[PDB]
Design an enzyme around this catalytic site. Sequence first.
Site, PDB file in Angstrom:
ATOM      1  N   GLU A 149       0.862  -1.171   0.000  1.00  0.00           N
ATOM      2  CA  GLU A 149       0.000   0.000   0.000  1.00  0.00           C
ATOM      3  C   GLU A 149       0.903   1.226   0.000  1.00  0.00           C
ATOM      4  N   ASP A 193      -9.077   3.093  -0.006  1.00  0.00           N
ATOM      5  CA  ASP A 193      -7.736   3.578   0.299  1.00  0.00           C
ATOM      6  C   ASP A 193      -7.514   4.941  -0.310  1.00  0.00           C
ATOM      7  OD1 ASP A 193      -6.974   1.360   1.697  1.00  0.00           O
ATOM      8  OD2 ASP A 193      -6.276   0.301  -0.119  1.00  0.00           O
ATOM      9  N   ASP A 242      -8.540   0.770  -4.373  1.00  0.00           N
ATOM     10  CA  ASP A 242      -8.232   0.007  -3.187  1.00  0.00           C
ATOM     11  C   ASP A 242      -7.176  -1.040  -3.500  1.00  0.00           C
ATOM     12  OD1 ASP A 242      -9.842   0.411  -0.574  1.00  0.00           O
ATOM     13  OD2 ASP A 242      -9.685  -1.764  -0.627  1.00  0.00           O
ATOM     14  N   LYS A 278      -5.264  -4.476  -2.765  1.00  0.00           N
ATOM     15  CA  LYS A 278      -5.497  -5.780  -2.182  1.00  0.00           C
ATOM     16  C   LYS A 278      -4.262  -6.639  -2.484  1.00  0.00           C
ATOM     17  CE  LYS A 278      -9.919  -4.832  -1.422  1.00  0.00           C
ATOM     18  NZ  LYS A 278     -10.439  -4.535  -0.065  1.00  0.00           N
TER      19      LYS A 278
END
Lengths: 237, 228
Positions: free
Chosen positions: B37, B66, B82, B84
């Site tokens: 991330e 996010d 986002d 993952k």
Amino acid sequence: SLRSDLINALYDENQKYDVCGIISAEGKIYPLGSDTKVLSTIFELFSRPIINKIAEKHGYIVEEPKQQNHYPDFTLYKPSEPNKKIAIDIKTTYTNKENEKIKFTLGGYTSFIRNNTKNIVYPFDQYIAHWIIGYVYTRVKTYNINELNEIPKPYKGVKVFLQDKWVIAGDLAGSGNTTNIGSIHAHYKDFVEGKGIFDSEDEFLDYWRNYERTSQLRNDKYNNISEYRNWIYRGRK
Amino acid sequence: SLRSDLINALDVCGIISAEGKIYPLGSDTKVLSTIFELFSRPIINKIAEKHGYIVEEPKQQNHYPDFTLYKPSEPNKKIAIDIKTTYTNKIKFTLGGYTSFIRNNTKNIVYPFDQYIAHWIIGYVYTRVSLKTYNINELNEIPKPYKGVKVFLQDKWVIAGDLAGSGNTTNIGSIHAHYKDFVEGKGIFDSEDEFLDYWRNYERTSQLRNDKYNNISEYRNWIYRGRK
DNA sequence: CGGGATATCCC
DNA sequence: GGGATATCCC
């Protein structure tokens, strides 16, 4: 002792350094965010070397889980004594104002404490101690190494403590669907000093091994330490 | 476009202290999720700027997504991104709760669900393979906790499967396939409308799903039945 | 407070 | 498929 020294090393290294980002082999530096998922990851990684070194000075071996979802973060022991193991778990939480009340989630109450070999590195009875290293932090472009001092941090006033789990354990859950034991809701000081509510580790373990999953079931059994002790007084009824 | 660009824009080995001591990575998944991330945020923000899009991350912690990108002009054309992650020693991802924002417009989400026009998923796949610290010039001796890492960008609905990605945490399960199918977007749903209707009426447990539907065949038969 | 969100995994 | 792992939110 292994413990005094461990707390000493942690407090020192912490009161000294500050992690400011992740770095690639190429030397690029990515800053951190102020979510506990980030800080948790950061604080666990920041501690593994220290734990290793101290464990080494006292002739202990350090082992981590081989499969995920298995407690504890670190298992220490001496080969010559494979039954007296120590469980070390690093837990993190945050605060906006310094020295405010905090609380931690202290692990599931339907796993290894209920089933000796459930989700744990070694069978529950092989450990004689369960230590929590708690970290408390205040929430506040890629980079080059030569910039390591200008990169901004998403945290301030980081505090840390080591204490036995049972000591800082509370009587209320830390989570619903994930059925976690909640710690006491207090100031950093009570954690350090170990001002908990349980009287013994057996009291701790009994209360959580019988804690009902829902308030509806607990309403019949017990919802807190006061009612637990009364519950005990009556003959567990 | 914003999308092809990011697709195009798309070896970390430790965390570093302002001091210069490099603390290694743990061979785990909670670690790599965080890593991946952090590694992504810069990339996304650089490409976003190029296209005059603002990037907002969450303020509250348990809040999707996010990243929220958008032109200050068109506030109802928001894009949800986002990150993952999953590992390889066929794969599956968890794609978010199916009881939150998809059933309640403003629940656990940065902006009302109705203001987002795309829900992209940036997936990372890694193959999982030191309790010492190191210094900047030692970077070449630090052991990596992962052997390889693939990444892909795709629309959430396209890679969605018909089985839950988690039980007590009620997540949408992605399709269970090869990296190539993810990039190819070889899903099971016919449209985003069907993806949403399927997950909006999904029951939490099997017994409750037993007299409704537990897979795509069943859902379709349930629609024909008149949704009952 | 307790229920249930955030992400990802295992028996 | 149910329930583990960590922590948070209203």
